[PDB]
Coordinates of C-alpha atoms in Angstrom, one line a residue:
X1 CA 20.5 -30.0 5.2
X2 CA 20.7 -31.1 8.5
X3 CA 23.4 -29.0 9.6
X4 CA 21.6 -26.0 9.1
X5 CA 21.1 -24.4 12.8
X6 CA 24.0 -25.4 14.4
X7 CA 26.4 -23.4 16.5
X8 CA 29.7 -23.9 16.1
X9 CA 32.8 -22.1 17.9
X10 CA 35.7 -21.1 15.5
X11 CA 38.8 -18.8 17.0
X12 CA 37.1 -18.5 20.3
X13 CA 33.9 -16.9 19.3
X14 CA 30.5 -18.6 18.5
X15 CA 28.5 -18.5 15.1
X16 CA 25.8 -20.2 13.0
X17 CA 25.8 -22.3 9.7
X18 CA 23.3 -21.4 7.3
X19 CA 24.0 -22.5 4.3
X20 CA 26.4 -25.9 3.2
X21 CA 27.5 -26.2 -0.4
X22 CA 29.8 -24.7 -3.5
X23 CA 30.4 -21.1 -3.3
X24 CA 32.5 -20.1 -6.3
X25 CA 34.5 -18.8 -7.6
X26 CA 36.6 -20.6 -5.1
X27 CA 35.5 -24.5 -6.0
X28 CA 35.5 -27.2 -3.2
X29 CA 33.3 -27.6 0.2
X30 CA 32.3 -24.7 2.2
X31 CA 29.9 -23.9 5.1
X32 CA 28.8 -20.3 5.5
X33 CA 28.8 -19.1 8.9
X34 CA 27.0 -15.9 11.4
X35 CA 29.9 -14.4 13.6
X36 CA 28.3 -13.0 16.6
X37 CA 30.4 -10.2 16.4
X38 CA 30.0 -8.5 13.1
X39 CA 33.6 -6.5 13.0
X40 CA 35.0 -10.4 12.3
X41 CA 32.5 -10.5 9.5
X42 CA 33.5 -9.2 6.2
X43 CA 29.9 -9.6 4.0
X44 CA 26.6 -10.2 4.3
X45 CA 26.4 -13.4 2.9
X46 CA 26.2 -13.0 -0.7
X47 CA 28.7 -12.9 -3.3
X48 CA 29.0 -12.1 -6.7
X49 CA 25.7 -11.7 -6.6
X50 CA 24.7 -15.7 -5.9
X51 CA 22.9 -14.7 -2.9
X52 CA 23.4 -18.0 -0.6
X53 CA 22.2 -17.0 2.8
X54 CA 20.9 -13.7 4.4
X55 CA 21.5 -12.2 7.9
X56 CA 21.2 -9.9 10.1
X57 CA 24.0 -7.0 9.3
X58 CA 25.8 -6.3 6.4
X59 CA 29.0 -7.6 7.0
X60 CA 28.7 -10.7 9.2
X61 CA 29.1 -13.8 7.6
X62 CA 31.8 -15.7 6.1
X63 CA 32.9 -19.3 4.4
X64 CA 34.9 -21.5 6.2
X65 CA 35.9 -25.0 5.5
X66 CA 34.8 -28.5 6.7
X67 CA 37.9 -29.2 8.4
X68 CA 37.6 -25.5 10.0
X69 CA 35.0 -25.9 11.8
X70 CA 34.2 -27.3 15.6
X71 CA 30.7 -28.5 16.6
X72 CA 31.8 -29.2 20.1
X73 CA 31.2 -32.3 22.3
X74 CA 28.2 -32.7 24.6
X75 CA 28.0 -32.8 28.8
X76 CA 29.5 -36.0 29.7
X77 CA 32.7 -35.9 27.9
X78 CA 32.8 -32.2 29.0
X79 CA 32.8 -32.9 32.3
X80 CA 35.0 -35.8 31.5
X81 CA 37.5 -33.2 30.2
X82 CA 37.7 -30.8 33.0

């Protein structure tokens, strides 16, 4: 529930979680996410009609796995790194 409201960066570009549980048909974890960029996007969050989460254009928002996804570190291990 928490997780809801983070930013995460996934293939370069930046999006939002909004929603973290099943989405069938396709069993197993998932964690919806908000591309920034809607022509990456391929719905508007729903599907099969199991609305999960809404957003802000009709195709912009996708599933993406656990292991899939990058919250990032914070400033002192940044700076660390570069």
């Amino acid at each position: 529930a928490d997780v809801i409201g983070r930013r995460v960066e996934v293939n370069g570009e930046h999006a939002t979680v909004r929603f973290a549980g099943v989405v069938p048909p396709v069993a197993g974890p998932w964690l919806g996410v908000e591309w920034d960029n809607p022509e990456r996007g391929k719905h508007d969050g729903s599907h099969e009609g199991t609305v999960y989460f809404k957003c802000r254009h009709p195709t912009g928002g996708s599933f993406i796995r656990p292991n899939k996804v990058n919250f990032g570190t914070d400033f002192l291990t940044a700076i660390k790194n570069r």
